[PDB]
Amino acid sequence: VNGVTPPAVQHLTAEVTADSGEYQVLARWDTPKVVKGVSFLLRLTVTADDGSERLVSTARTTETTYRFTQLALGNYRLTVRAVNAWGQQGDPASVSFRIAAPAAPSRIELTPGYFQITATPHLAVYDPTVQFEFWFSEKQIADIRQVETSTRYLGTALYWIAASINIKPGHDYYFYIRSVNTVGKSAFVEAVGRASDDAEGYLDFFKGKITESHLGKELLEKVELTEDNASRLEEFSKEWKDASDKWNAMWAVKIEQTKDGKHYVAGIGLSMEDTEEGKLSQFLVAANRIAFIDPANGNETPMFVAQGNQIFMNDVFLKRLTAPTITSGGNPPAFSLTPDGKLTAKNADISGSVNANSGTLSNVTIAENCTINGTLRAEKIVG
Amino acid sequence: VTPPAVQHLTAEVTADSGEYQVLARWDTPKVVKGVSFLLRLTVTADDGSERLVSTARTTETTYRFTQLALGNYRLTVRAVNAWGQQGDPASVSFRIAAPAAPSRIELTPGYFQITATPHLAVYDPTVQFEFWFSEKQIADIRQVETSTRYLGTALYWIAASINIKPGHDYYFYIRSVNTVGKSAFVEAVGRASDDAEGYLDFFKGKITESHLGKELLEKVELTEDNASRLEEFSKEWKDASDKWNAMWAVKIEQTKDGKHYVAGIGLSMEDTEEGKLSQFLVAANRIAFIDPANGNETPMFVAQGNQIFMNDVFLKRLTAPTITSGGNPPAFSLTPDGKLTAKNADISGSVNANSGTLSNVTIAENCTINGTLRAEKIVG
Amino acid sequence: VTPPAVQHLTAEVTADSGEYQVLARWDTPKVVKGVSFLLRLTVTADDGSERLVSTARTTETTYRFTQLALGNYRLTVRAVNAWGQQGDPASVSFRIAAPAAPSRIELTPGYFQITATPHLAVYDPTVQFEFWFSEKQIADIRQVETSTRYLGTALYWIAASINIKPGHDYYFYIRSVNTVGKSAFVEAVGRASDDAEGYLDFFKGKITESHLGKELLEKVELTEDNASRLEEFSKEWKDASDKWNAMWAVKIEQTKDGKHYVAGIGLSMEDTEEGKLSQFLVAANRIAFIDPANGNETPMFVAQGNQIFMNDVFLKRLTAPTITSGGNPPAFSLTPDGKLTAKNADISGSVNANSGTLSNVTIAENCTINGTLRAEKIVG
């Protein structure tokens, strides 16, 4: 025999890829004669900023190919050996590569809307060749790797405006944004967002949708009865193809009058019109006052009512409310809460604590420990 | 194993097929791959003793008893498995004999309405009531059924309709009605609450005194026990005062067990001093709003018996003489009379108050006093 | 040589036949040349011992003792050979008097039903239960069985009435029954389930299990791509229960890239096991109530899926397990745990508190520390 030491490899190549994200590297080369194998021992180290090394992996194969899987982006150096059956290590070779990626978006801002949400993201420094890729989600995803799968891919711009019928107010939505450009893709920056919440801020929105439809441009905005004094109490069902060449439907009762040189109308209409992506139903009732009742044993008082923007309910169990304003009624409100935060009360019992930044009383009475860690001042004392 | 208990037993009294019949229905907690049920119906003797009448062993969830005469009865069910392990029993006492005379009567006024409710000298849950309304006193009971208003037949009857106005003393003549028959009539002397307003009592009042009100109520046509009627129409007419009256309604009525049943939907504008005033009035026992996107089926808005359910909602200002969170102990709650109730409250500012009732205090800095201090055990 | 004790000694008491009795049953152990059962029944006297009552010798594995009185008893059985050498004894112990009425009663309030499940301290396997429901707590107890709807007699009840509607209390009168007697009565209180989203899937229960659902939803009428059908139909017709079912509806369906979109509302009045029920189903992707008053074009009530949006509103009570002012930092809130949030609390009255933590407090009158003052610094 001869324990001949294995002369080092040449034509050592590293190929960098990003198959499932989390970049890998495929190490490959060629060799002349081998004895009871002649192993290949590999080890791969990243140069830190200052020129010192992290150990990243090792590898004990026999063929002239290998792959390194969970990777971070860093300046990597891969060294390959050649040990023989006895275990006498040949001279090394080494190759160096990088994985340069765009800088993350440093802060992304998230102004609400009406059934919509804007992310406008910004980088720590200005970058001319950066454009961000946005993926939207409704549930905080576990880790910042499976976003490539479990989060819808919105699109890619300098910003995005997610509108739909499904971004619903007071349910937070997490935006996942990664910077992209010619050089690669960064990590995923996460952020939360909302919809505006503001109640009366939704009603104008709805008015706007309503108006731009079959029932808006039929039940109202219809210009018949051109003679003072009439009652064209009308009721039909029309379905037809549109300029988009899709079917649309409405069936209504339109009633309307002319008296004293002025017009009126009231209008129970039901439809389903097309949209770019699907069909939106709708059941729009315009009238000077709406109310319902349970007629049980002679009872005729409506269960609810509403008439030019004031709606009259007996008792409700709400899943959750959310008004900026509350009153006992009257003009000493027995209690109140206002858009500023003030909880106007009368007699305010609390089974728990009151972490208040301050007090402002007359007549106090503590039945156990009264601690003072500040500058206590007093006039007359008898205890 | 024993099959579980008997759930939802009932003690009812039918006379549909020409004579009296006692049905019951029983549903199973969890169903045990071959549940059987013994059920025992027995009578009370003149000495108040127990006599067996009918024992049925069946594997079905309902049964009927036919050719059953007058008297008081007791009905039990047990569950028996294949191996023969009779379970816990569930037993209800019922009666085939009735019409007692109502002992007291309860009267609650209201805006254009007045509640008459029965009180029977002994309770009996196999009974409903006929109500008759009179504007003039009827001395003899014979024309009480003939020369008055047929209010109807039900449980708790409130007087509220077009013929009812504040300030007149109305009368009630009511009796007990069942499968057996009806009793000696009883009277009461009662008055509507004129106008107390609530905040919808004005809207009821507005509603009653309208053409929709007259159409979709107090039209009591089609009165054939266990029959019914539908109409979808639009009757436009010119009124007394030389003006139009438009209207469109969908009205359904039925009659069953002597009692009158109805609902529907109206859209109308009448004539007021200014001119026309449009509408949509629904009356019914449950209304209910649905959104079928994705084939989701859960309402967002369900109202029955003057109450609402609603999922999430938003608002420009609540106006509300009381709130809770719900709970036998409600997590928080403002009272109409100004009291607040909470397990906690963390204010990021200043607590302007009159007084204090604090078992513990922990003031972190300066405490200015301009009055008198009284501290038992003092350190410093 | 010695025969063994009688095993599995089982006693059941009854007085149904006219007055009080005990059935004693057991299983014979293996003996020599025949066997006789000796039974000795004693009652616990005033002294804590047992006064001897009756003694019999028999030869059948079951026996009866008649015309005994009320008390806790020791019944001893022995196995005797032909020679008179009696085996080991087996003495059972079992109790008699008016059974003890539950110590408690627990209500898991279900969505539109109570589940009132009693319990005692010292458990007797051989007492049943009577249950009673009422809407009004009664002054006395002696007229409950004269003034209360009879739920009946089981181990636990679930109580239902169709009109049940959450979030009011209703009062309970339970008792233990057995062969001895109906116990003294017992009180309790309860309500129903409070949550709304629960009701709304509940009501979805009620919605879908109707011919309303079965026509509106559940039927997949139409097929080929770009299908659209609009129809107005009515029927009041015979069903299997010999009832008329009465329904007018509006319905639309459409097919776009295959997927099938329905919407449609309808008044109806179908039949229930108690009476005909008159119920609204509006369904659409979105319903708005909007007003025509003076070129009015803005809503006051927009229900888009699981949400509602509204304007200024007017309630009478509220039960809402969260209310927040909007904004990521809300002006105020109450999450369900009863924690309040705010920035001013001008309770112009007593803060009836359990803790305060007020960094820099002003007092301008009497401070009366019943506990421990504790001050780093004082300049008084």
Author numbering:
A (entry chain Z): 613 to 995
B (entry chain F), C (entry chain J): 616 to 995
Copied sentences from the primary study:
Bacteriophage lambda’s tip protein, gpJ, plays a crucial role when attaching to the cell surface. The gpJ trimer not only seals the tail tip into a closed cone but also extends a central tail fiber, providing the means through which lambda phage directly interacts with its host. Genetic evidence has identified the E. coli receptor LamB (ecLamB) as the direct target interacting with gpJ during the phage’s attachment process.
Following extensive cryo-EM image processing, both the tail tube and the density of the FNIIIs of gpJ were successfully obtained. These enabled the visualization of the tail tip opening and the deformation of the central tail fiber. The AHS situated above the CSF experiences a dramatic orientation shift of approximately 180° (right) and enfolds back onto the CSF. The C-terminus of helixes (841–861) in the AHS domains have transformed into two additional β-sheets at the top of the CSF (colored in deep blue). The loosen of AHS helix bundle leads to a reduction in the restraints on the FNIII trimer from the bottom side. The linker between the HDs and FNIIIs disengages and repositions, leading to the alignment of two FNIIIs (gpJ-a and gpJ-b) on one side of the CSF, while the third FNIII (gpJ-c) relocates to the opposite side (right top). Compare to the closed state structure, the distance from the FNIIIs to the remote end of the RBD markedly shrinks from 29.7 nm to 13.2 nm.
